[PDB]
């Protein structure tokens, strides 16, 4: 698992497109190498300074060596390595590089999320699916940073120090450093797993307590069904105590981890210092070697202080990146595109042949359904409240797929046509239109982006909404939606009419809204529909009399099956739609 995940990380490391960023990557790697070299060099110069000082050297050489050592200590981090001029140049350049990868990953995720089929988006919520994506991009960035620039450099420092001590200092100090660092790493990992178990146990109860508090605040019914303020306080207190117990366990585990790491490094330092002092007394080592060993041990210790955290974060980011990859691979485009060739929209003839469709498991909704609309002619659909009418509207728009049957537009099966042209050629008015947070002019032009402002104004005039736009103070810069002011029913229905005018479609998949409003504005809206649906193939879905009376072919659906066919007056005489119209609306 480690090998494959490292392979994916390495694949994401190199910027594929720009050449100006690979140079920056190489410079950053070179700076990392230079930091390792400085890590080795500085204690050596400290030893040289002490050795020169102990033998009464003249002022000139001492001054120049002191200046050089101070300069090296400035280049290296004055503390914890995250401080020097080097590695800060590195943070700068890696800012510039990591920005590119973050943008690319975010755009790839956002461009994949917009092509999955509808059933996928009706299934899962939006908050969870966006949390996974955000956490995935943060995971890839943090994994690259953490590993490459904080974990491998330290494991290289340990090995380099082992080599230097074992070859250029003595033989036993190699054993000392090796044993100390091995024990440190082993104990850190072993304690860290245990502490992770405790941390998860605490986090669950924290979330539960927050939920309880939110629930007690939202329902101000505590006053009604009792004087139960005290009870809601007491349950909150009990939950708080439970959470506090778990938190105490977790943080005591943290303190234990810190103490064991400190004890290991202290034992190593004690052994090394005692051996070095004994050797110095026996004229085998010089006075500077003592401070060399002390400084180098502290220098090794400082990065090691943050390895439990790195272990935790590496594991978490690995599982997160696996989640993000497994939704990137989820190629559920079930209503995909086999073949190509744009639909030839001559006039707008729609056909049906005993189509079979079933999206709800077990039961089947649409069976043996076939009808036809002449170009320009208007068809209506009436029946009991359910899904069949909206379902067939969705089927015509190529959202789901037909299990068995045939469905054509102008003698052309839409199963073999590209989705883009199909969806471009067909207009529609939904149940309730939604205006995203932007200006009114932008919402109008959203029907066709390339169009200019004059078309926007002309269509707003054509839809009878332009005066109400002038009623707003700012006008065409007015903030709309949740951020801006709220809109009444006629306003949003008219803006939908405006944008569907902009789109200039051939078929209007009208779906009349059931929103309650004054009859005058309602009849104005229906008139606007009448002059926008003129000379265009139309399919109307409504529970009202207005669509029924003037339509050309009324259809009735019972459990997703055609029971009555024909015209308004024949259905009236049959004793069918007559009873439904008299009972439903009266």
């Amino acid at each position: 698992d480690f090998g494959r995940k490292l392979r994916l990380l390495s694949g994401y490391l190199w910027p594929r497109g720009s050449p100006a960023l690979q140079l920056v990557v190489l410079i950053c790697l070179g700076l990392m190498g230079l930091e390792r070299a400085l890590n080795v060099l500085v204690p050596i110069f400290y030893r040289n300074i002490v050795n020169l000082l102990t033998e009464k050297a003249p002022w000139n050489s001492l001054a120049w060596t002191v200046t050089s050592y101070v300069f090296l200590k400035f280049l290296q981090g004055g503390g914890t390595g995250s401080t020097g001029f080097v590695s800060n140049l590195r943070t700068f350049l890696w800012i510039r590089v990591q920005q590119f990868t973050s943008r690319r990953v975010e755009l790839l995720i956002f461009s994949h999320l917009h092509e999955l089929s509808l059933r996928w988006h009706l299934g899962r919520r939006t908050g969870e699916v966006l949390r996974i994506a955000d956490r995935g991009t943060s995971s890839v960035t943090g994994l690259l940073s953490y590993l490459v620039f904080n974990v491998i450099p330290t494991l290289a420092d340990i090995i380099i120090g082992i080599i230097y001590f074992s070859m250029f200092f003595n033989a036993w100090f190699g054993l000392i450093v090796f044993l100390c660092m091995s024990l440190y790493l082993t104990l850190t990992i072993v304690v860290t797993e245990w502490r992770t178990k405790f941390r998860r146990a605490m986090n669950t109860q924290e979330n539960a307590t927050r939920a309880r508090a939110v629930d007690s605040l939202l329902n101000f019914e505590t006053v009604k069904y009792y004087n139960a303020e005290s009870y809601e306080v007491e349950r909150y207190r009990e939950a708080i105590i439970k959470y506090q117990g778990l938190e105490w366990k977790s943080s005591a585990s943290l303190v234990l981890l810190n103490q064991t790491q400190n004890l290991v490094i202290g034992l190593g330092l004690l052994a090394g210092s005692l051996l070095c002092a004994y050797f110095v007394t026996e004229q085998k080592l010089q006075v500077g070697d003592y401070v060399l060993f002390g400084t180098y041990i502290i220098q090794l210790y400082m990065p090691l202080n943050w390895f439990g955290t790195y272990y935790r974060m590496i594991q978490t980011n690995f599982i997160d990146m696996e989640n993000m990859f497994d939704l990137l691979k989820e190629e559920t485009e079930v209503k995909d595109l086999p073949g190509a060739g744009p639909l030839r929209f001559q006039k707008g003839r729609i056909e049906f042949e005993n189509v079979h469709f079933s999206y709800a498991d077990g039961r089947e909704t649409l069976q043996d359904v076939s009808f036809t609309v002449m170009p320009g002619q208007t068809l209506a659909l009436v029946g009991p409240s359910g899904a069949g009418k909206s379902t067939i509207l969705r089927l015509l728009f190529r959202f789901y797929d037909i299990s068995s049957g045939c469905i054509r537009i102008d003698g052309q099966d839409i199963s073999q046509v590209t989705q883009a042209s199909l969806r471009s050629h067909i207009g529609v008015v939904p149940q309730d239109t939604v205006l995203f947070n932007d200006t009114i002019a932008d919402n109008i032009r959203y029907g066709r982006v390339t169009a200019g402002n004059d078309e926007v104004e002309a269509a707003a005039q054509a839809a009878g909404i332009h005066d109400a736009i002038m009623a707003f103070p700012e006008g065409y810069r007015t903030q709309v939606g949740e951020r801006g002011l709220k809109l009444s029913g006629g306003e949003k229905q008219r803006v939908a009419i405006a944008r569907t005018i902009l789109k200039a479609p051939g078929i209007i998949l009208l779906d009349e809204a059931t929103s309650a409003l004054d009859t005058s504005n309602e009849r104005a809206i229906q008139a606007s529909l009448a002059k926008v649906c003129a000379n265009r193939t139309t399919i109307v879905v409504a529970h009202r009399l207005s669509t029924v009376v003037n339509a050309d072919q009324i259809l009735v659906i019972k459990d997703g099956c055609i029971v009555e066919r024909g015209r308004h007056e024949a259905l009236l005489s049959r004793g069918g739609v007559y009873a439904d119209m008299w009972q439903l609306q009266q």
Binding site: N203, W306, T309, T316
Partner: peptide
């Protein structure tokens, strides 16, 4: 080490 988690 933070608590970062």
């Amino acid at each position: 080490x933070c608590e970062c988690g």
